[model samples]
Target: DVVKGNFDISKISGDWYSILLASDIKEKIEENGSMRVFVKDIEVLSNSSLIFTMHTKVNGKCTKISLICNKTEKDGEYDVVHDGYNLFRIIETAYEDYIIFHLNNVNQEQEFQLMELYGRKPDVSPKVKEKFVRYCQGMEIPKENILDLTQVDRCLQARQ
Candidate 1:
């Protein structure tokens, strides 16, 4: 039931790390997209808002940003500003170890959907890993563009 929404998102808090990501346009998540980040963990506020502790890059400096996702009408949905307004949701999560965060971003003149696969541990079973690819396919993201973060050394190094 919770998988479809209407669940307490606070359970999603705790240490986590990015494992993969996909988007309509690679630039929105690749090259210099704000999403090229490594989530160190998540914290839930008293009012249901979420505080994300993540590491990204700023002019060659490994910077830390506390991205906040405010509560929405629904349990899993959130309102946030990054590139622009983003309709964020945790489409589903295994709860035991992994979560799939989805974002429908509406930028100044562009709109796209983004998906991130993160886990308590850096690795997951091959079967569970395929779940992310399946969602990207459902979202119509380009096949080759579904990046596996383990293969991306640049940003991962910053998490160091």
Candidate 2:
């Protein structure tokens, strides 16, 4: 049970990196949409990073959706957070929908793939690693690709 709405998205600042939130597992995604979906009780390794764990209810299922804000400029026209699994893929198709952002090959796609795996079997998905690679290949971007500056890197480079 979560209230659907846009989050401030201001949680990130100063050469922002990536942000991630947990999705409401109880909610079913009704329509196809791009979301930075993650699991609940997620651990934020660093505070310099931006992350907002939100609860979204789609269809009758509840899942927590996360907002992952990346600092590097994406090759696409705009920055985006995509839900690769569709979370609602089973709901419908061919309808205009809103996406947090356009889909990115490595980052967003990898995160979404991981999320799908996490939901399916927590950490026991024997095929998750392979599945992740497959998804990455589909995007034409391999999982080995790296973002310009991750929170860990940003912190080390800043050296405050």
Tell me the number of clashing residue pairs for each predicted model.
0, 20
Give the runs in model 1 whose Cα sits over 4 Å from its true position. Answer: 1-4, 154-160
Worst 10 residues of 1 by lDDT: 1-10
Compared with the true structure, all predictions reach lDDT values of 0.79, 0.29
Worst 10 residues of 2 by lDDT: 89-98
Cα lDDT tens digits for candidate 1, 1-160 = 1264655567778888788888887876785786677788889876667898888878877787888878788766888888789998887887668888888988778888888988878867767678789988988987787888876653455564
| CA RMSD of all predictions | 2.2, 17.1
* lDDT per residue as tens, model 2, 15-117: 2222211122212221233332332322223432334354444553455555543333322122224433222111111112111222323444244322222
C-alpha TM-score for every candidate: 0.89, 0.24
Best by lDDT: 1
- Model 2, which residues run further than 4 Å from truth? 1-37, 41-116, 146-160
